[PDB]
Short mmCIF file of all heavy atoms in Angstrom, two decimals:
data_model
loop_
_atom_site.label_atom_id
_atom_site.label_comp_id
_atom_site.label_asym_id
_atom_site.label_seq_id
_atom_site.Cartn_x
_atom_site.Cartn_y
_atom_site.Cartn_z
N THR A 47 24.19 -1.23 3.71
CA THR A 47 25.64 -1.39 3.53
C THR A 47 26.20 -2.61 4.30
O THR A 47 27.16 -3.23 3.85
CB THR A 47 26.45 -0.13 3.87
OG1 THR A 47 26.08 0.35 5.20
CG2 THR A 47 26.13 0.98 2.94
N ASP A 48 25.59 -2.94 5.40
CA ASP A 48 26.02 -4.07 6.23
C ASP A 48 25.44 -5.42 5.85
O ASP A 48 25.69 -6.42 6.53
CB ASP A 48 25.83 -3.79 7.73
CG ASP A 48 24.36 -3.73 8.09
OD1 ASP A 48 23.50 -3.81 7.22
OD2 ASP A 48 24.07 -3.55 9.31
N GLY A 49 24.64 -5.49 4.77
CA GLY A 49 24.05 -6.67 4.34
C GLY A 49 22.70 -7.01 4.96
O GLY A 49 22.03 -7.99 4.60
N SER A 50 22.31 -6.21 5.98
CA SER A 50 21.00 -6.33 6.53
C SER A 50 20.03 -5.74 5.55
O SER A 50 20.42 -5.18 4.55
CB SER A 50 20.89 -5.60 7.90
OG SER A 50 20.97 -4.16 7.68
N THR A 51 18.74 -5.90 5.83
CA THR A 51 17.65 -5.36 5.02
C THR A 51 16.65 -4.63 5.86
O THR A 51 16.39 -5.01 6.98
CB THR A 51 16.95 -6.52 4.28
OG1 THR A 51 17.87 -7.24 3.51
CG2 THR A 51 15.86 -5.98 3.26
N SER A 52 16.12 -3.51 5.33
CA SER A 52 15.15 -2.68 6.07
C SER A 52 13.80 -2.83 5.40
O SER A 52 13.67 -2.96 4.15
CB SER A 52 15.61 -1.22 6.09
OG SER A 52 16.85 -1.08 6.75
N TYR A 53 12.74 -2.82 6.22
CA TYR A 53 11.44 -3.31 5.76
C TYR A 53 10.31 -2.33 6.14
O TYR A 53 10.19 -1.98 7.29
CB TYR A 53 11.11 -4.65 6.44
CG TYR A 53 12.02 -5.80 5.99
CD1 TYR A 53 13.23 -6.02 6.62
CD2 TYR A 53 11.70 -6.61 4.90
CE1 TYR A 53 14.06 -7.03 6.25
CE2 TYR A 53 12.51 -7.64 4.54
CZ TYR A 53 13.69 -7.86 5.20
OH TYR A 53 14.51 -8.89 4.78
N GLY A 54 9.56 -2.00 5.16
CA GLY A 54 8.25 -1.37 5.40
C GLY A 54 8.28 0.11 5.49
O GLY A 54 9.28 0.80 5.18
N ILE A 55 7.17 0.67 6.00
CA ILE A 55 6.88 2.10 6.01
C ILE A 55 7.94 2.89 6.81
O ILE A 55 8.29 4.02 6.37
CB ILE A 55 5.46 2.35 6.57
CG1 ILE A 55 5.01 3.81 6.36
CG2 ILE A 55 5.34 1.95 8.02
CD1 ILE A 55 4.34 4.04 5.05
N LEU A 56 8.49 2.26 7.82
CA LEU A 56 9.53 2.92 8.61
C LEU A 56 10.85 2.23 8.54
O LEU A 56 11.75 2.49 9.34
CB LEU A 56 9.12 3.05 10.06
CG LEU A 56 8.05 4.18 10.34
CD1 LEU A 56 7.47 4.04 11.70
CD2 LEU A 56 8.74 5.53 10.13
N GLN A 57 11.05 1.34 7.52
CA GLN A 57 12.32 0.70 7.29
C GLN A 57 12.97 0.06 8.52
O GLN A 57 14.13 0.28 8.82
CB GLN A 57 13.26 1.67 6.53
CG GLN A 57 12.80 1.97 5.14
CD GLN A 57 13.00 0.79 4.22
OE1 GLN A 57 14.03 0.58 3.68
NE2 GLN A 57 11.89 0.03 4.06
N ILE A 58 12.16 -0.71 9.23
CA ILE A 58 12.62 -1.49 10.39
C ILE A 58 13.67 -2.42 9.90
O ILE A 58 13.47 -3.20 8.95
CB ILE A 58 11.50 -2.22 11.02
CG1 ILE A 58 10.27 -1.30 11.42
CG2 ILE A 58 12.00 -3.03 12.24
CD1 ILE A 58 10.62 -0.24 12.41
N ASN A 59 14.85 -2.44 10.59
CA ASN A 59 16.01 -3.17 10.08
C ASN A 59 16.25 -4.50 10.75
O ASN A 59 16.05 -4.73 11.93
CB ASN A 59 17.26 -2.25 10.22
CG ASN A 59 18.48 -2.88 9.70
OD1 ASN A 59 19.30 -3.45 10.40
ND2 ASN A 59 18.65 -2.77 8.32
N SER A 60 16.72 -5.45 9.91
CA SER A 60 16.88 -6.86 10.35
C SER A 60 18.08 -7.14 11.28
O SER A 60 18.12 -8.16 11.84
CB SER A 60 16.94 -7.75 9.11
OG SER A 60 18.07 -7.49 8.31
N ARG A 61 19.01 -6.19 11.41
CA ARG A 61 20.18 -6.40 12.21
C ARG A 61 19.78 -6.57 13.71
O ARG A 61 20.40 -7.37 14.39
CB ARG A 61 21.27 -5.34 12.05
CG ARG A 61 22.48 -5.50 12.88
CD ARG A 61 23.50 -4.42 12.58
NE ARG A 61 24.74 -4.54 13.34
CZ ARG A 61 25.35 -3.48 13.89
NH1 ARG A 61 24.85 -2.26 13.78
NH2 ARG A 61 26.48 -3.68 14.57
N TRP A 62 18.84 -5.80 14.14
CA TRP A 62 18.40 -5.79 15.54
C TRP A 62 16.95 -6.18 15.76
O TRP A 62 16.65 -6.78 16.80
CB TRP A 62 18.68 -4.47 16.22
CG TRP A 62 20.10 -4.15 16.41
CD1 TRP A 62 20.84 -3.30 15.68
CD2 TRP A 62 20.97 -4.71 17.40
NE1 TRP A 62 22.14 -3.29 16.16
CE2 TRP A 62 22.23 -4.15 17.23
CE3 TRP A 62 20.79 -5.65 18.44
CZ2 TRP A 62 23.35 -4.48 18.03
CZ3 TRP A 62 21.87 -5.99 19.23
CH2 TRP A 62 23.12 -5.39 18.99
N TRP A 63 16.13 -5.82 14.82
CA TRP A 63 14.69 -5.63 15.18
C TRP A 63 13.69 -6.67 14.69
O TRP A 63 12.68 -6.88 15.34
CB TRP A 63 14.27 -4.24 14.82
CG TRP A 63 15.13 -3.20 15.37
CD1 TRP A 63 15.99 -2.41 14.69
CD2 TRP A 63 15.26 -2.80 16.75
NE1 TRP A 63 16.67 -1.58 15.56
CE2 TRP A 63 16.22 -1.82 16.84
CE3 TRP A 63 14.61 -3.24 17.95
CZ2 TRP A 63 16.58 -1.21 18.02
CZ3 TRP A 63 14.97 -2.64 19.12
CH2 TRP A 63 15.97 -1.66 19.14
N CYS A 64 13.96 -7.30 13.55
CA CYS A 64 13.01 -8.33 13.02
C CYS A 64 13.88 -9.47 12.44
O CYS A 64 15.05 -9.31 12.18
CB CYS A 64 12.09 -7.72 11.98
SG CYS A 64 12.93 -7.02 10.51
N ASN A 65 13.20 -10.62 12.31
CA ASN A 65 13.91 -11.73 11.66
C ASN A 65 13.61 -11.92 10.16
O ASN A 65 12.40 -12.09 9.82
CB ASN A 65 13.56 -13.03 12.37
CG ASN A 65 14.21 -14.24 11.69
OD1 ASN A 65 15.43 -14.28 11.61
ND2 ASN A 65 13.37 -15.11 11.18
N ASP A 66 14.64 -11.90 9.35
CA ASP A 66 14.48 -12.27 7.96
C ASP A 66 15.20 -13.53 7.51
O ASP A 66 15.18 -13.90 6.36
CB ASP A 66 14.74 -11.09 7.02
CG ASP A 66 16.24 -10.69 7.04
OD1 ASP A 66 17.10 -11.34 7.67
OD2 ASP A 66 16.50 -9.70 6.33
N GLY A 67 15.88 -14.18 8.49
CA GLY A 67 16.54 -15.45 8.21
C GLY A 67 17.79 -15.34 7.39
O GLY A 67 18.34 -16.34 7.00
N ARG A 68 18.24 -14.12 7.01
CA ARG A 68 19.45 -13.97 6.21
C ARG A 68 20.38 -12.84 6.64
O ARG A 68 21.14 -12.32 5.86
CB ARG A 68 19.03 -13.78 4.73
CG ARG A 68 18.35 -12.53 4.41
CD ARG A 68 18.34 -12.25 2.86
NE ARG A 68 18.06 -10.83 2.63
CZ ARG A 68 17.67 -10.33 1.45
NH1 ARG A 68 17.51 -11.15 0.42
NH2 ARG A 68 17.43 -9.01 1.30
N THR A 69 20.28 -12.45 7.92
CA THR A 69 21.19 -11.40 8.47
C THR A 69 22.01 -11.99 9.56
O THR A 69 21.57 -12.08 10.72
CB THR A 69 20.34 -10.22 8.95
OG1 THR A 69 19.42 -9.80 7.90
CG2 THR A 69 21.25 -9.02 9.28
N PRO A 70 23.25 -12.38 9.31
CA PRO A 70 24.05 -13.12 10.23
C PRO A 70 24.41 -12.32 11.50
O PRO A 70 24.74 -11.17 11.45
CB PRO A 70 25.35 -13.43 9.47
CG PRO A 70 24.92 -13.43 8.05
CD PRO A 70 23.86 -12.34 7.94
N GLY A 71 24.20 -12.99 12.62
CA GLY A 71 24.58 -12.37 13.91
C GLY A 71 23.53 -11.40 14.39
O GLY A 71 23.77 -10.69 15.35
N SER A 72 22.39 -11.40 13.74
CA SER A 72 21.38 -10.40 14.04
C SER A 72 20.48 -10.83 15.14
O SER A 72 20.46 -12.00 15.58
CB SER A 72 20.53 -10.11 12.78
OG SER A 72 19.65 -11.20 12.52
N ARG A 73 19.69 -9.86 15.66
CA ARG A 73 18.70 -10.16 16.72
C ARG A 73 17.33 -9.88 16.09
O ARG A 73 17.25 -9.43 14.99
CB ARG A 73 18.96 -9.27 17.89
CG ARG A 73 20.33 -9.43 18.56
CD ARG A 73 20.38 -10.71 19.42
NE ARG A 73 19.53 -10.54 20.60
CZ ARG A 73 19.90 -9.95 21.73
NH1 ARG A 73 21.11 -9.40 21.80
NH2 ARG A 73 19.08 -9.89 22.73
N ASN A 74 16.30 -10.18 16.86
CA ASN A 74 14.95 -10.02 16.48
C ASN A 74 14.18 -9.41 17.72
O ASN A 74 13.34 -10.09 18.32
CB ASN A 74 14.30 -11.36 16.09
CG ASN A 74 12.82 -11.30 15.72
OD1 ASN A 74 12.28 -10.22 15.58
ND2 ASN A 74 12.17 -12.45 15.63
N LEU A 75 14.57 -8.23 18.08
CA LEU A 75 14.12 -7.65 19.37
C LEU A 75 12.63 -7.35 19.34
O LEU A 75 12.02 -7.20 20.43
CB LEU A 75 14.95 -6.49 19.75
CG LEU A 75 16.44 -6.78 20.03
CD1 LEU A 75 17.19 -5.48 20.38
CD2 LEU A 75 16.55 -7.78 21.18
N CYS A 76 12.00 -7.14 18.18
CA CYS A 76 10.57 -6.91 18.09
C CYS A 76 9.76 -8.20 18.00
O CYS A 76 8.50 -8.16 17.92
CB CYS A 76 10.21 -5.97 16.97
SG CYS A 76 10.82 -4.29 17.31
N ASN A 77 10.47 -9.30 17.97
CA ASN A 77 9.84 -10.66 17.95
C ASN A 77 8.85 -10.78 16.77
O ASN A 77 7.66 -11.16 16.99
CB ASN A 77 9.18 -10.95 19.29
CG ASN A 77 10.10 -10.71 20.44
OD1 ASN A 77 11.12 -11.34 20.61
ND2 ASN A 77 9.70 -9.72 21.29
#
Side-chain angles (χ1 to χ4, degrees):
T47 53
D48 67 356
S50 68
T51 304
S52 299
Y53 295 87
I55 190 89
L56 284 168
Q57 291 290 275
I58 305 299
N59 183 263
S60 64
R61 178 175 182 225
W62 290 104
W63 307 108
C64 60
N65 176 61
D66 68 5
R68 69 165 198 196
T69 309
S72 74
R73 300 281 292 278
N74 177 14
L75 295 177
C76 291
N77 311 295

